[PDB]
Amino acid sequence: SALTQEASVSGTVGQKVTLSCTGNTNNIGSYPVGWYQQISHGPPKTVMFGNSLPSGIPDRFSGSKSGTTASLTISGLQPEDEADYYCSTWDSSLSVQVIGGGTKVTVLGQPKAAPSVTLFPPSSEELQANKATLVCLISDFYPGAVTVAWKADSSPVKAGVETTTPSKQSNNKYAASSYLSLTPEQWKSHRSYSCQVTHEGSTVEKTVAPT
Amino acid sequence: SALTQEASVSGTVGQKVTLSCTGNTNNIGSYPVGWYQQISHGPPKTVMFGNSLPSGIPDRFSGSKSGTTASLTISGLQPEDEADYYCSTWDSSLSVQVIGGGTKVTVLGQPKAAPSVTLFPPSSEELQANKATLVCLISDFYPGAVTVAWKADSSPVKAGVETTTPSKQSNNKYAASSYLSLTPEQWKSHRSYSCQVTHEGSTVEKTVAPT
Ligand SMILES: [Br-]
């Protein structure tokens, strides 16, 4: 996505909370930014546009912009704000409206939990079949929204990544998976591979290497 | 909602489907309508603005509008067209972007595919940390509904099992993962552990062993 939003932004009731939306000079750096809110699967509604507060929305919501990063601040987080928030703007470089991935804003009803990250190399059984897959297990995190990035050696992998939608497990925390399909030629040629998981203020990165 | 959309619409592969967006004179009747596609609660993409086709969106998407009702027509439904579609415009009585409730498009008759199962033994990084985790990667299956059962040697295992709800990946197929938490001594005390995946009455099972 041309616009980058954080995965999860949470806090207790009455807490000052801030979302961000990062792009480039051809979208956020020169065009107004709108923020839309969607609860469950209900109808989305505009809650901020061009740093201007729409009629009917409370003034706890405030929008600002500095360079290529727009922000939505919620001064006094309340339970009725628990929703997904999407930012969007016009992208003159592509001549189309452009929308970010969305941020899940959660009112904490349970302790915030950073995720456990376990990186699995390709088993010898799979490589004996001329196949290679790496799995990055993301477990026991709340709220259920994370950002995953992969690195070949120390350079990012810009293709081949598949990350599952977080799902709630039996302990009421969330779990997800991110797998990367390779060939035996790449797994041996590279010195290491990395999976990086971002959950609010916590970022965990695991690294594995061929035997 | 100020904009009215049908809740859900279905159609087989190759059918022509038309979604409608109903509004007012101060919003739909006066201003261009944009259509936005959201998948797997992923980043949404605009598929039609002002009845004109953006770049990269195939020709099968066409837009029309007459009076206070705008329409998006999708000829030749494909698996990747299956999504939620939202329409939005500018309202003039109010001064806001307004969004409809969305239309869930379900593409029928998509090809079936058995899941590819990959069972990962506990990594060396976590065995040295006195941990043990088996991960059963399930991918490339349609439809998106599996049932996972584990085995220690030949005995069923339930305690320590968590399975992710399937989610659609970039190939329009589903992916999930089930993980079993063990201690390092359970892991070597047994001959093997197994992960059985059942999809559409047919079973795929994998088996791993220590070191
Ligand atoms: Br702005």
Residue numbers in the entry:
A (entry chain B), B (entry chain A): 2 to 212
Sentences from the paper on this structure:
LCs were distributed in two groups: a set of eight amyloidogenic LCs responsible for severe cardiac involvement and symptoms in patients (hereafter, H LC), and a set of five non amyloidogenic LCs isolated from patients affected by multiple myeloma for which no amyloid aggregation or proteotoxicity was observed in patients (hereafter, M LC). Five H LCs (H3, H6, H7, H9 and H10) and two M LCs (M7 and M8) were successfully crystallized and their 3D-structures solved. The crystal structures were all refined to satisfactory refinement parameters; in all cases the LCs were dimeric, with an overall quaternary arrangement closely matching that of the previously reported LC dimers. VL and CL domains display very different structural properties in the seven crystal structures. CL domains (res 115–214) are typically characterized by high quality electron density, are all very well superposable, and the dimeric CL–CL arrangement is clearly conserved in all the analysed structures (root mean square deviations -r.m.s.d.- generally fall below 1.0 Å over the entire CL–CL dimer - Table S3A and Fig. 4B-bottom).
(ii) All the selected LCs were of the λ isotype, which is overrepresented among amyloidogenic LCs (approximately 75%), all the H LCs (except H10 from germline 1–36) belong to germlines commonly found among AL patients. At the protein concentration required for Near-UV experiments four LCs (H10, M2, M8, M10) precipitated before the unfolding process was complete, thus Tmapp could not be determined. Analysis of the data shows that the kinetics of proteolysis correlate well with amyloid propensity: H3, H6, H7, H9, and H16 are almost or totally proteolysed after 60 minutes, and more than 50% of H10, H15 and H18 LCs is cleaved after three hours. Contrary to the limited information offered by the spectroscopic analyses, controlled proteolysis provided a robust indication that M LCs are more rigid, or less dynamic, than H LCs. These are however divided into two subsets: H3, H6 H7, H9 and H16 are very efficiently proteolysed, while H10, H15 and H18 show slower cleavage kinetics. In H6 and M8 dimers all six CDRs (three for each LC monomer) are traceable in the electron density; in H9 and H10 five out of six are traceable, in H7 three, and in H3 and M7 only two CRDs are traceable. In some cases (H6, H9, H10) CDR3 (residues 89–97) participates in the interface; both CDR3s in the H7 dimer lack electron density, while in M7 and M8 CDR3 residues are located far from the VL–VL interface. In the structures of all H LCs and in M7, the association interface is roughly symmetric, and is located on the five-stranded beta sheet (strands 1, 3, 4, 7, 8), where the 3, 4, 7, 8 strands establish the intermolecular contacts.
